[PDB]
Amino acid sequence: KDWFLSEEEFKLWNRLYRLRDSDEIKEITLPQVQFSSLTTGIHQLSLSEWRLWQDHPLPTHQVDHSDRCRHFIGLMQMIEGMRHEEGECSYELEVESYLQMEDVT
């Protein structure tokens, strides 16, 4: 068949799925890619609002977590572990005795 919705599919989409100007949310948007160093009816999906839920691996269905997602989870765990340090930093204490000056500038 066709790439576009048939008349019947279009009717279904219009009455079941399409968001409308009178719905409480009339549009869902995704944050756009922006590199900083180089809306009443509009819901922007957040990747940060639920940050406190992210220090544990969440359920999967058919797609296993990736290595970068495991790193993300581990970093969130590290941040949680340091959140209530004032001043003197445990990470510094764990690594700074291994520093070799020849490695750096």
């Binding site: 068949k1 576009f4 819901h43 999906l45 359920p59 058919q62 990736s66 970068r68 993300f72």
Partner: protein, 74 residues
């Protein structure tokens, strides 16, 4: 139920930078499956988060909770 290959082809062509680019027939079939896996993954993960909270349905809150880990997997 799934994405028609006719649609997926146009979806891929919409974003190509170069008019020379083509998609093999087997690659297109695979991209049909991959898009479905993505949709189903998002949907089932939202379902699990709803079940864990004993929610009546998957609302945007529940999807957003699973989102960073979903997008990092893909």
């Amino acid at each position: 139920s799934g994405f028609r290959k006719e649609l997926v082809s146009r979806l891929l062509h919409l974003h190509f930078k170069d008019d020379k680019t083509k998609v093999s027939g087997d690659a297109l079939q695979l991209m049909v499956e991959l898009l479905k896996v993505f949709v189903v993954e998002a949907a089932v993960r939202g379902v699990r988060q709803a079940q864990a909270e004993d929610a009546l349905r998957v609302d945007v809150d529940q999807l957003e909770k699973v989102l960073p880990q979903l997008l990092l997997d893909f």
